[PDB]
C-alpha cells in the first residue's frame with residue numbers, strides 16, 4: 001500500500017511506502033487527531049520483559065543487517081541466536097559498537113519533529129556504556145562538550161550511557177540541556193534569568209549549588225549514575241562557548257546585556273534501540289536561529305525581551321495592530337544570526353534549514369520510501385509560509401530506533417539520603 | 418477517553434467531552450497522522466444519499482437541534498422527527514424549516530475546525546435562497562449578499578444558501594472559488610500578470626465569453642450554474658466591490674507599488690452539509706485577518722510574490738538569506754495592509770487579536786459545549802506563529818456535523 005504527499009507550492013508529489021514499516025502508535029484515531037498534543041503519552045516512556053524484548057531485538061537486527069547488506073547471512077543468523085540466548089539467560093542484551101552507532105544515527109533519522117535531519121548520517125557516537133559513576137559521567141560530558149563545540153565549528157555528537165536494566169539503576173542527566181541558564185523567581189514575582197529553568201535551578205540550589213544569581217548563569221550538571229542520588233558538577237567555563245548578542249545596525253542592542261550559548265545539547269530524552277532503553281544520551285548539534293531569537297528571547301514564558309527591544313526601537317506598543325511585536329521579533333532574530341556569524345559559531349537561519357529539510361525529505365523518499373515528519377514542529381515559529389516546508393504535506397508516524405520523552409527524574413527517583 | 422488539552426504558555430487545561438459526538442472521520446489512524454494533508458478524502462463530500470443513510474443523518478441533526486432549544490424529547494420534537502421521517506419515506510429527501518436551516522449553517526461554521534474567526538459564529542446572517550431557479554436569480558442573490566455583507570466597510574458575516582442537491586444532475590454551483598478574486602493572465606514571456614492562483618479560472622472566463630481588461634487587479638466575473646446547466650457570466654457591479662488601496666504609514670514609496678485588495682473575503686466553492694442534505698452552492702463571507710492578504714496573497718511565491726520588490730525599496734541586504742530581509746519586508750507589508758484597511762474604516766483583524774479571540778472562544782466552547790474541534794495547522798497564523806497564543810495551545814481535531822466540506826471543481830464534473 002502506497003501513500004501520497006504533495007507540495008502545494010511546487011506540485012511535487014512523493015510516495016510513502018515506509019509508513020508500512022511503522023510499529024509504535026501516533027495517538028490519533030480515525031475519529032480524532034492528536035497532531036498538536038505536545039507529548040502524546042505514546043511519545044514518552046515500565047521495564048521490558050523477555051516476552052516483548054526479543055521481537056524488538058529481532059526487528060532491530062533485521063533492519064541493521066539489511067543496511068549492511070547482510071540480511072540472512074551467517075553473521076546475521078548467529079547474531080540473532082546470540083542475542084536470543086543472552087535474553088533468555090540475562091533478561092536483556094548488549095549492542096555491539098556497530099549496532100549502537102547505527103542505532104543512534106537512525107534514532108535521529110527517525111525523529112519526525114527534527115528539521116536538521118539532513119545531517120543525520122554524520123553523528124559522532126561516543127559510547128559511554130563503561131561509565132559507572134556521576135564523576136565518570138561528568139568526564140564523558142565535558143569531552144562531548146569540548147568535541148562538539150570545536151572552537152565554534154560545531155559537530156553533531158551523542159554520548160550514550162549504560163542502558164536501563166530494572167529501572168532501579170538508571171543513568172539520567174537531570175538537566176534538560178547540558179548548557180542552559182539559571183532562572184530565579186524573585187519574591188516580587190519577577191524572574192531573573194531563564195524562567196524555563198526556575199524549577200531545575202531550585203533543585204540545584206537545594207542540592208548545594210552556590211548560585212551566582214546572575215541573569216546568564218550556566219547551570220551545573222546534575223548527574224545520576226546507576227540509580228544513585230544525583231551529584232553536582234560545574235562545567236569548566238572555558239568549555240562553555242558563548243556569543244554576546246549585538247545587532248548589525250542597532251548599536252544600543254549590545255547594551256541590553258544579552259548573550260547566549262553556542263551549543264544546543266538535549267540531555268533529558270530517551271534513546272530506544274532494539275527494545276533497550278538508554279535513559280541518558282545527551283546529544284548536540286548546532287542552533288537554528290529562531291530557537292534562540294523567537295523562543296528563548298521572545299516567548300512570554302521566557303526572557304520576554306520583546307517589550308524592551310520594542311521600547312528601544314520606539315514602536316507603537318499601545319495597539320497590537322502596529323505589529324510592533326512582529327517587528328521586534330525580526331530584529332532580535334537578525335541580531336542572533338549576526339552575533340553568531342560574526343564569531344564564526346555555527347548557526348543556520350530558518351530559511352536555509354527548511355530548504356535543506358525539503359531536499360533531505362525528497363532524498364529520503366527516493367532512497368528510503370518515506371520520511372516521517374511532524375509539520376507542527378517542522379514549520380519555523382516565525383515567517384512560516386515563506387518557508388517551503390509550510391506548503392509541504394507530511395506524514396507523521398513512529399519508527400524505531402527513536403528518541404522518546406521520559407518523566408523528569410526528580411518525580412520518579414527514590415532518594416538514598 | 419475524556420481527553421484534555423493543555424496550553425503551555427498559561428498551564429490552562431481544558432477537558433474535551435465533545436469529541437465523543439464526532440461522526441465523520443479524520444484521515445488519521447493509530448499508525449499514521451495525516452493532520453497536515455491539505456485535503457484528506459474525508460474532507461470532501463455521484464455519491465447520492467440512499468433513503469437509508471438519510472434518515473439517521475436527519476435524526477442526529479434534529480436531535481441536537483431540539484436539544485439546543487431545550488425541547489429534547491418534547492411534543493414538537495417527536496412530531497418533527499415523525500414528520501421528516503415520513504417525507505423521507507416518500508420524497509427520498511426532505512426540506513429544512515427556516516429555523517433548522519439557520520441553526521444548521523451557524524453550526525457548520527461553529528464546527529469548522531480550521532477557522533480561527535469562529536468566536537462570531539452565532540451572529541451569522543443567513544439568506545435562504547432555496548427558491549432560486551436560474552443563474553440570473555443566483556446573480557441577484559449574490560449581489561444582495563455582497564452589498565449586505567460589505568455594508569460600506571462595516572463588514573457583517575453572511576451566508577446565502579441555494580437549493581440543495583437532489584440527484585446530482587440539478588446542481589447549484591458558484592464556479593468561482595471566492596465571490597471576488599483578481600484575474601490572472603499568462604504571458605508571452607512566461608511570467609504572470611495579476612493573480613497566478615486564478616490563471617486557469619481567468620482562462621475559463623475568457624474561454625466562455627469574458628472580455629478581460631488585462632489589468633493587475635481585474636475583478637473576475639461571476640460564473641454561476643443553476644439546476645445543472647451551462648454556467649453564465651455576470652459582472653458584479655463595481656460599486657459593490659469595496660477595494661482598499663495599500664499604503665504604508667511610514668514609507669511614502671509604498672503607495673507607488675500600486676497595490677490594493679478587496680475588502681470582502683467570501684468563499685463560494687464549498688459544500689454545506691446539514692442533516693444529510695448537501696448545499697453545493699452556499700457562498701459565505703466575513704472579514705479578513707490581515708495575514709491572509711499580506712502574508713499569503715501578496716508574498717506566497719505562487720501568488721503576487723512581491724517580497725522581492727518591497728525589500729529592494731527598503732534597501733535591505735538581499736544577498737544572504739540570513740539577513741532575514743524576507744522577514745523584515747513581510748512584516749512591513751502586513752503593517753501596510755492593516756493600516757490601509759483601518760484608515761479606510763474597512764473591517765479587518767490582526768493575527769494577534771484574532772488568535773487571542775480564538776483562545777477565549779475555545780474557553781467558551783469548553784465551558785458551555787464541552788469542547789471545540791480545532792486544526793492547529795490552520796489556526797496558527799502563517800507569520801509570527803509562536804508569539805501568538807494559539808501556538809502554545811494544544812488542539813484536538815475532529816469532524817462534527819453540520820459542516821462545510823470541499824467538492825470537486827465543477828469544470829471537471831460538468832457535462833458541458
Ligand code: HEM
Pocket residue numbers: 104108111113114115116117119123156157158283284285286287288291348353377403
Ligand atoms: C545539527 C543541527 C540541528 C538542528 C538545526 C536541529 C533543529 C531542530 C529543531 C528546530 C527542532 C524543533 C524543537 C524545538 O524547536 O523546540 C528539533 C527537534 C528534534 N531534534 Fe533536531 N536539530 C539538529 C540536530 C539534532 C541531533 C544531533 C539530534 C539527535 C541525535 C536531533 C534530534 C532531535 C529530536 C529527537 C527532536 C525532537 C524533539 C521533541 O520531540 O521534542 N537533532 N531539532
Ligand code: HEM
Pocket residue numbers: 526529530531532533534535537541574575576701702703704705706709766771795821
Ligand atoms: C468573520 C471573520 C472570519 C475570519 C477572520 C476567518 C478566518 C479564517 C482563516 C484565517 C482561515 C484559514 C484558511 C486560510 O488561511 O486560507 C479560515 C478558514 C475557514 N473559515 Fe473562517 N473566517 C471568518 C469567517 C468565516 C465564516 C462566516 C465562515 C462560514 C460561515 C467561515 C468558514 C471557514 C471554513 C469552513 C474554513 C476552513 C476551510 C477548510 O476546512 O479547509 N469563516 N477562516
Ligand SMILES: Cc1cc(N)nc(CCc2cc(CC[C@H]3CCN3C)cc(F)c2F)c1
Pocket residue numbers: 116264265266269283284285286287288291
Ligand atoms: C540537538 C539539538 C539541535 C538544535 N538545533 N536544537 C535542539 C533543541 C530542540 C529540542 C527541544 C526539545 C524539548 C523542547 C520542548 C519540550 C519542552 N519544549 C517545548 C527536545 C529535543 F530533543 C530537541 F532537539 C537540539
Ligand SMILES: Cc1cc(N)nc(CCc2cc(CC[C@H]3CCN3C)cc(F)c2F)c1
Pocket residue numbers: 534682683684687701702703704705706709821
Ligand atoms: C469567510 C472567510 C473569511 C476569511 N477571513 N477568510 C476566508 C478564506 C479562508 C478559506 C479558504 C478556503 C480554501 C483555501 C485553500 C484551498 C487552497 N487554499 C490552501 C476555504 C474556506 F472555507 C475558507 F474559509 C473566508
Ligand SMILES: C[C@H](O)[C@H](O)[C@H]1CNc2nc(N)[nH]c(=O)c2N1
Pocket residue numbers: 008390391392393394453454455794795796
Ligand atoms: C500542506 C499544508 O497542510 C498546507 O500548506 C496548509 C498548512 N496550513 C495552512 N493554514 C492556513 N491558514 N491556510 C492554508 O492554506 C494552509 N495550508
Ligand SMILES: C[C@H](O)[C@H](O)[C@H]1CNc2nc(N)[nH]c(=O)c2N1
Pocket residue numbers: 036037038376377378425808809810811812
Ligand atoms: C501546543 C503545541 O503542541 C506546542 O506549542 C508545540 C507546537 N509546535 C512546536 N514546534 C517547535 N519547533 N517547538 C515547540 O516547542 C512547539 N511546541
Ligand SMILES: [Zn+2]
Pocket residue numbers: 028032033034035445446449450451452
Ligand atoms: Zn493526526
